[PDB]
């Protein structure tokens, strides 16, 4: 019964030739109309959104806190001797900071020298297109002391006492608000509370906090945070080649050959947290410099 393939009375795979053509033509016209309808409705959907602002921005309410070595499990395990052991880290650090070199920020028509001291926020009008392409404040690698150097094509970083810079998730129209001067026990920090978003690292338990001996932070002018002069963001369309602020963190006194957990928590009023997303506001890392 399964040899209905053909017959002398014209049938192929079950039906005749003229029937195969009729069905194929119908399905082509039908699916063509379906495709045109889906495209037209998707076009109307495209007409309901703008180019300078996402309609819904509530799903990114608490900004994240990422790092340069995008580790497979947020763990930094390498050997202070073997150069190939830490190649995966250095490669990502150099590729990340490849857009922050002094040669990359050379055009004065799209770059603006903010300043050597963190100042107030810089609002460049509204988000419409009435104004031209906004300017982006420069951020030279020199701000991250002891984790930038004047190295060659390969940034000779720290083998012993590694460097891990942190970055605040770029959000459109987000205006960071540092905590009030009435700081509710925020782990010794400088008195530059009004024009910089503080970020403080620490261990996770009584063991990790003890293993991690000393940490040294580096930022704009020497403050452990992000300057307010670089916010808010005006989208990729209006501000291309934008450089969000960076802040490096070096762990000097670490216990070699021991995996220790570090939690870098960013503080502020407009900075939320989440018990489900360990990256919203805070940030975790598992460092282990095994010799």
């Amino acid at each position: 019964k399964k040899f209905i393939w053909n017959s002398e009375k014209k049938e192929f795979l079950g039906r005749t030739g003229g029937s195969w053509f009729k069905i194929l033509l119908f399905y082509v016209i039908f699916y063509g109309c379906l495709a045109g309808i889906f495209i037209g409705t998707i076009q109307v959907m495209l007409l309901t959104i703008s180019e300078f602002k996402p309609t819904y921005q509530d799903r990114v309410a608490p900004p994240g806190l990422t790092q340069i070595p995008q580790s497979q499990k947020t763990e930094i395990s390498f050997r202070p001797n073997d150069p190939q052991s830490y190649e995966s880290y250095v490669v990502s650090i150099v590729r990340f900071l490849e857009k922050y070199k002094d040669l990359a920020q050379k055009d004065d028509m799209i770059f603006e020298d903010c300043g050597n001291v963190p100042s107030e926020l810089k609002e460049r009008g509204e988000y419409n297109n009435e104004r031209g392409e906004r300017k982006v404040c420069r951020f030279r690698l020199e701000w991250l002391g002891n984790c930038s150097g004047l190295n060659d094509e390969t940034y000779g970083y720290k083998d012993g006492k590694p460097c891990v810079i942190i970055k605040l998730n770029r959000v459109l129209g987000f205006k960071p608000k540092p905590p009030k001067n009435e700081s509710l026990e925020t782990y010794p920090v400088m008195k530059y509370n009004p024009y910089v978003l503080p970020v403080h690292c620490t261990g996770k338990r009584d063991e990790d906090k003890e293993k991690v001996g000393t940490m040294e932070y580096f930022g704009l002018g020497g403050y452990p945070g992000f300057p307010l002069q670089y916010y808010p963001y005006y989208g990729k369309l209006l501000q291309p080649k934008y450089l969000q602020p960076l802040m490096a963190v070096q762990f000097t006194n670490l216990t070699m050959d021991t995996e220790i957990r570090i939690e870098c928590k960013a503080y502020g009023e407009n900075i939320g947290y989440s018990e489900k997303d360990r990256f919203q506001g805070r940030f975790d890392v598992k460092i282990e410099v095994k010799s």
């Binding site: 379906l34 959907m45 996402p54 309609t55 994240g64 770029r170 963001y233 989440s274």
Partner: protein
Amino acid sequence: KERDMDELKKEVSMDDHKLSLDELHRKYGTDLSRGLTPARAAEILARDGPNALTPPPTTPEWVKFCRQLFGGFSMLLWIGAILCFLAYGIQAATEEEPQNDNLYLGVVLSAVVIITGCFSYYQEAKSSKIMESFKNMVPQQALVIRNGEKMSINAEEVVVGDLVEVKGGDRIPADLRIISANGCKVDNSSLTGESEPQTRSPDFTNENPLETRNIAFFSTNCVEGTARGIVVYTGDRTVMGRIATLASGLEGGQTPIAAEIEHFIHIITGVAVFLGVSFFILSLILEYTWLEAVIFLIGIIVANVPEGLLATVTVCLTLTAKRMARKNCLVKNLEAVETLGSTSTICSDKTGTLTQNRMTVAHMWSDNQIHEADTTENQSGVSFDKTSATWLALSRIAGLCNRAVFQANQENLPILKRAVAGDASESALLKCIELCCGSVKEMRERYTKIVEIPFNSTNKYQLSIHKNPNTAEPRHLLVMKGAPERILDRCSSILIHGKEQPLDEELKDAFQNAYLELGGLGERVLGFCHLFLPDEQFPEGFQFDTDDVNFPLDNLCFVGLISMIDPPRAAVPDAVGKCRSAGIKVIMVTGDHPITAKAIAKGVGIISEGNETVEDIAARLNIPVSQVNPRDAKACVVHGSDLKDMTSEQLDDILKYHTEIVFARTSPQQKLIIVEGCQRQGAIVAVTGDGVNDSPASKKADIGVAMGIAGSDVSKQAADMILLDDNFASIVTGVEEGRLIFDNLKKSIAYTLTSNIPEITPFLIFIIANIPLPLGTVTILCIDLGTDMVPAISLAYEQAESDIMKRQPRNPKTDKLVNEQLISMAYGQIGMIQALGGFFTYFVILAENGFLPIHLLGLRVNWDDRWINDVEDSYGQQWTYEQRKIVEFTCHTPFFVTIVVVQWADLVICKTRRNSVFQQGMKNKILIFGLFEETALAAFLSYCPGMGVALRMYPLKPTWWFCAFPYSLLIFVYDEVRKLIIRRRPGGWVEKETYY
């Protein structure tokens, strides 16, 4: 080596009854008047087994439970669950942090099969639980003569070759050999099918052991008289034993619904493996390794398996079975409910099924005029003119000259269905008088009987004399009855409206033709006459003793003939007509006399009025019957004696060239051959019976229908459906529901099969375009086992779009439950629009949140990563892991809602296959509640506290609920105009290509 055992049972039985009394006494070694010694009795009783049918094969309850856990639909879900654990095995040991979706689904699929097994098993077992409440086995005793003394022992304590006596009213224990009869009339109705009470004579009458009179049979009842015999057969070696054991060992076959389900699974997996394989090869061609591609193959094939359709179809059938149980129509099988609709040939039994299996007064002959009487079981017909003098005469000739009265408890029972002792003929006459002529108690005692003359062995006549209490004449009243030949030879006066006339031939020949009219009609006629006795020649003191000629045998006054026959059941004629109205070939199969079978067949509809047989034409032309061409005879009567000398090709020809067939004098083992002959054509067979002769027939047929009370226990157990109220119209009800549930089943299938496209397409384009997952796994479960449950079940409640009892029965080769047109509709067009409607809402949510659709290409690589918390959208924003996964899950939730919205329109367009929604009408309250429950449930699964945690079904912004409205309305309009073009163009393009 049981094949030879069954073959030796399909053959007609042989015997050795045709022997002399001395030869029988020598073969069995038993005294013919004293019997055998009790020592020999117990010696045989403990030698070959007690006289009782060996019990049926017990069916343990765990066996049929495991049975419900398998089959066709369940096995598919089993291979699916096994494939889930297989894919999970490939995913666990090979990659990091494997997703528990596959295993989470495998356990659910297994639970689906298990729960369905529990429900279906409890249902099929409940049908048998109420069956165990119908076995009223009253242990009866037998009368055996042993050592010269009569004793009443248990029927199981009877052995072979012992003398047995029976009293009028007793049931024949084992198969005897009549050695001494005295007015013995037994009832071989439930066995061979003989309707009228067959007499039993000790002399050898016919070579066939069934038609002969010197053999008493098992399970037969002695109607009247006494008889002696020697037990020839015992236990299972009996006649009905050799029939019961044959029925217990026959095959059941494959129900048509099961064949449709199997073929449906064939198409399902046929396209499932096609898409899974072509996509597996395509995936390997792209970039994915064998490890990933195998998981994709398993996912695509398993996803193409309708998970919830199993329970929806099971309940779909159970619901229709409920209506069967309400109308007293029990179905032991949960699928045999549909078989009546797909039937095209009904093999009915005459005596007990078609007829009432009870002798009833048929017609009368008053004033030289035939008068039909009400022959219905419930008494709902036209009544004869009952206000004349001839009636007051004849009614008294019946109410006085009859040896029949009622019994003890017969006081509150109805007039007809009450027990009566005496002759069957006398019982019928007593009933007709007790109903159409007041009562018989005072009507009989009002005329004190003086002398009676019972029926004779030769020249059978029953006469008596009674006093006359009429206040107008103190004379005597002499009454007599008998065969119409005994009254014509002893009469000269004739009654008419009150006065008398001579025996003038001008009206005597008018009596003869009226005798042949009621005689050729398969009825048994009786003559009733009376004469006044002159009180001057026989005063009120002369006791005419029963010795010599005391009454005038001649010169009597004839009142009228009274014929009788077993009438067909009440709604039987109309029901047979309804079956023929649908195209069901009705074939009467019985083992009674052709003289009666042909008459009842004409009286019920199996023989149309006007069509002739091969014999009727010869009788009409006064020519030899072997001359006419059998093609001129549309109908034909087949004498079972001739059926013995036939082949398969011959019976095939009998059924191919003759539309109305009546099989008579057919043995129980021959009914099996007849059913197999009707099955060799390729049609569906339903055999309706009551007696034990219908057991192998009701077992081999595609569906057997047994009478609930007027049928034996063997055929009733070996049947597939039981008419608990014996109302044959339940057959018409069954065929209606079978076709109804068939079409409604197709609708429910197209419904569940439509949702498969939007359930699988997200995973397909997930692999091709490499976009984030548009539809999750748990959401798919919420669609197949959540929302779509009530719509699918509600679709079974739909009514008839046109007259189903008008169209011809479905063809098994052409009309399939799941044709390629249905797949072209659900999997082809409708489900495709639903899939596009889902992808629309997908792009809406993502583009509005910052991820434009053009930017979603090749994004799943880093999107599915757990640690990349800086993924860029089209606006330059950096999303973390949970922040983007929240959008993915809150993107699965509206996709699920989108499927529900398009399923609204799909459910409404599936409600009508050919009609329009405006023509039919949204009156299915189950469907209305299905829409409201589906919607409210989908909303509850999104806005309830903890859904984003338990099922990751985050709440939805109200604008999402309208992203699917245009696609739903589009589906509704396109399918409505489809059902419109099919209405105005019954040609076939829009019909033969889409109309499923």
